[PDB]
Design an enzyme around this catalytic site. Structure first.
Site, PDB file in Angstrom:
ATOM      1  N   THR A 179       0.824  -1.200   0.000  1.00 29.40           N
ATOM      2  CA  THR A 179       0.000   0.000   0.000  1.00 29.40           C
ATOM      3  C   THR A 179       0.866   1.261   0.000  1.00 29.40           C
ATOM      4  O   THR A 179       1.844   1.347   0.740  1.00 29.40           O
ATOM      5  CB  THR A 179      -0.915   0.026   1.240  1.00 29.40           C
ATOM      6  OG1 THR A 179      -1.750  -1.139   1.237  1.00 29.40           O
ATOM      7  CG2 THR A 179      -1.784   1.266   1.239  1.00 29.40           C
ATOM      8  N   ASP A 228       7.811  -5.339 -13.940  1.00 25.42           N
ATOM      9  CA  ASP A 228       6.430  -4.948 -13.717  1.00 25.42           C
ATOM     10  C   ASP A 228       6.115  -3.591 -14.322  1.00 25.42           C
ATOM     11  O   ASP A 228       5.408  -2.783 -13.728  1.00 25.42           O
ATOM     12  CB  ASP A 228       6.131  -4.953 -12.212  1.00 25.42           C
ATOM     13  CG  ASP A 228       4.666  -4.623 -11.963  1.00 25.42           C
ATOM     14  OD1 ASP A 228       3.836  -4.881 -12.862  1.00 25.42           O
ATOM     15  OD2 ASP A 228       4.345  -4.116 -10.859  1.00 25.42           O
TER      16      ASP A 228
END
Ligand SMILES: CS(=O)(=O)CCNCc1ccc(-c2ccc3ncnc(Nc4ccc(OCc5cccc(F)c5)c(Cl)c4)c3c2)o1
Length: 289
Positions: free
Chosen positions: A24, A128
């Site tokens: 997060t 990614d």
């Protein structure tokens, strides 16, 4: 110190930006003057290995690549970096689905290509790359982020499937050429102003269609010249895909005559929002001068 070891009292998480696949991210302030920063707290002594990869994230120095400013090793691990005021490129093109001309679109491709080539010189496979992992410092300049984490968190030890190269999906093989595949999808995301790749199609069936020869569709604004580059990035044969160094040259050339490669209506005719958005003070830029 290249990788600052921040004390829990030096920074503060104020609001939530969003939840990623590795952890997060929060927006906050860093009080070594208060410095606006993004704070990433990872999902889950072993910090030795973490500090090592962390160091790589902090030793990068290129204008198209985000740099890690510091780390905090308490119960969990927190990564701290300069806050990018315009958020991520993905939401940006979505929000400005209109007022975005060919000059910006192509310049972003060039910038991201420079950033990837730079990571390739540091022998760092991103693993990614996606429009969501490209930040907007200013509408004129974007920067790649989130590299290093995939490997660190076990991306190649016994899932961005829609951005991954065939070889990465089947064999957990990640190279600079597998990053080129992801680069192709990222570009596709830009040109479609934020469309979801293979929208609808189940992740488990992706390797299957890719093997069948199916590829993301040609974006409406793209001349077949820009699309060919995208297709070339998605070749089964990794060594046949373009190199970042070549992509830089090609997109740069296209950036000299944008309206010839991208067809957008009203292209020629083409602030407070992000202030009320991100504002909760000196830029990490000024402070680290
Ligand atoms: C686009 S979407 O619809 O899919 C969901 C929206 N994504 C959530 C979101 C919105 C905005 C942000 C955001 C805004 C500004 C930011 N500024 C700086 N960093 C941000 N994120 C981030 C990414 C990685 C981090 O640590 C890893 C790392 C790796 C390499 C180099 C580095 F500098 C850092 C950290 Cl600490 C923050 C950010 C996100 O994230």
């Amino acid at each position: 110190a290249l990788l600052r070891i921040l004390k829990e009292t030096e920074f503060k998480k104020i609001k939530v930006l969003g939840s990623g696949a590795f952890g997060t991210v929060y927006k906050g302030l860093w009080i070594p003057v208060k410095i606006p920063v993004a704070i990433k707290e990872l999902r889950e002594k072993a910090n030795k290995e973490i500090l090592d990869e962390a160091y790589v994230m902090a030793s990068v120095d290129n204008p198209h690549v985000c740099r890690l400013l510091g780390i905090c090793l308490t119960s969990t691990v927190q990564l701290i970096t300069q806050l990018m005021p315009f958020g991520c490129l993905l939401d940006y093109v979505r929000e400005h689905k209109d007022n975005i001309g060919s000059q910006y679109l192509l310049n972003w491709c060039v910038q991201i290509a420079k950033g990837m080539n730079y990571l390739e010189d540091r022998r760092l496979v991103h693993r990614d790359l996606a429009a969501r992992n490209v930040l907007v410092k200013t509408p004129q300049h974007v920067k790649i982020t989130d590299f290093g984490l995939a490997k660190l968190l076990g991306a190649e030890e016994k899932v961005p499937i829609k951005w991954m190269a065939l070889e990465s999906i089947l064999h957990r093989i990640y190279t600079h050429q597998s990053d080129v595949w992801s680069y192709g999808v990222t570009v596709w995301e830009l040109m479609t102003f934020g469309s979801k790749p293979y929208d609808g199609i189940p992740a488990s069936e992706i390797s299957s269609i890719l093997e069948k020869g199916e590829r993301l569709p040609q974006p409406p604004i793209c001349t077949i010249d820009v699309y060919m580059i995208m297709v070339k990035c998605w070749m089964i044969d990794a060594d046949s895909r373009p190199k970042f160094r070549e992509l830089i040259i090609e997109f740069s050339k296209m950036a000299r005559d944008p309206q010839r490669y991208l067809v957008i209506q009203g292209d020629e005719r083409m602030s407070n929002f992000y202030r009320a958005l991100m504002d909760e003070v000196v830029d990490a830029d000024e402070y680290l001068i």
